[PDB]
């Protein structure tokens with residue numbers, strides 16, 4: 001059957017792990033557990049199509065760059081995650097976007113922009129400027145919350161379509 | 167200009183409250199790395215590494231409202247740590263790691279545990295065994311190097327624990343985690359996945375080696391955090407005996423790694439010439455002058471300082 005190699009990227013502590021596990025395991029993980037590189041498989045059905053997600057979850061820390069290159073090369077689609085209460089994570093999004101472009105030799109790579117932690121009141125990054133940045137890239141933007149599961153199944157499924165339309 | 171000529175500026179950078187450095191940390195973004203190299207050399211020169219790193223980390227902590235995110239993102243503080251540790255804890259990494267890593271390279275016994283990543287008629291029980299033995303061998307080497315961390319770096323970890331205690335008194339677990347996130351997450355495990363960071367190796371890992379390093383660093387990271395595998399990936403479940411039997415050996419390490427409360431200063435930096443870095447720091451002020459004016463507009467303790475900064479920056483602008 002059809003496999004999709006999705007890759008989840010973003011700064012440390014933004015909620016890539018939390019996103020992936022709420023998808024894989026159907027619950028919220030609230031505990032300290034920084035990632036190195038965890039990998040999950042899960043066969044699902046999106047729009048009638050039976051398919052298999054090979055999801056890679058990565059480490060966001062600048063120390064783990066260069067180790068970035070290998071998983072990018074094999075990846076098919078990229079969730080680029082930041083936190084709406086952490087603006088600095090938002091500005092980091094650019095660097096992942098440019099690196100992903102470099103390693104694969106292209107400018108229109110299957111990408112989705114995910115803004116995580118929207119359940120929070122203390123939000124410093126507005127929905128609009130995230131939507132603006134998304135359009136200027138040519139890729140969708142989805143607001144999710146791993147705590148509540150809003151937009152989660154959306155955000156991953158959207159990436160799949162975005163791979164199919166490429 | 168003559169180093170003499172930066173004096174008035176040089177003595178505003180070093181002020182204990184560290185007000186300027188925080189401001190800079192807000193203003194930069196793409197100069198983060200560059201700026202770090204410049205601040206560290208300045209502070210290493212008049213032996214204030216501790217003043218800088220200790221206060222800066224304390225600021226990040228006092229500004230953190232949720233604990234499970236502490237020092238996870240890429241601030242200046244976490245870059246300042248990064249570049250400092252790469253400078254002072256190289257030998258440490260060679261001691262703990264060099265032997266265990268080189269053995270892993272020359273090996274051909276695969277450590278794969280993942281029910282899908284597995285070759286045909288590959289024995290996953292043989293694999294588990296071999297991995298565990300490496301892990302045991304390695305972490306024994308890691309644990310018995312607690313004393314190998316330079317004294318001054320240990321002090322700053324002590325700084326880190328002093329902080330987390332003043333901030334979260336009711337939480338006893340943080341004092342170890344907060345150290346683990348640097349010595350493991352941001353030092354040991356990276357050096358495991360990529361041995362050229364510290365120049366342990368000079369060669370590209372084989373496909374089997376590359377896998378084992380992830381499998382090993384993943385395992386070390388779980389222990390370093392104190393989490394059993396179980397709730398995440400399924401295949402990793404049989405590496406837990408190791409975690410359970412070393413769980414406490416880790417808590418010792420992380421706790422006592424910061425067990426220096428007196429500042430060290432021997433092997434002190436000889437008096438030479440700073441101008442090159444003071445120029446380059448001033449140049450980062452020029453480049454962010456406007457932005458620092460916006461921050462100086464906000465009244466408060468840093469204000470008078472931030473006022474004087476732009477004056478000094480502009481006055482040194484003119485004098486060149």
Ligand SMILES: Nc1nc2c(ncn2[C@@H]2O[C@H](COP(=O)(O)OP(=O)(O)O)[C@@H](O)[C@H]2O)c(=O)[nH]1
Pocket residue numbers: 010011012013014015016017018019029030031032033034035060116117118119120144145146147148234235238
């Ligand atoms: N409120 C809230 N917290 C979240 C959300 N996603 C993650 N977190 C928390 O943020 C921290 C880091 O999550 P994690 O996924 O491990 O980060 P990552 O792996 O470094 O991207 C943990 O304390 C999570 O429980 C979310 O949507 N909402």
Ligand SMILES: [Mg+2]
Pocket residue numbers: 016017018033034035
């Ligand atoms: Mg994670």
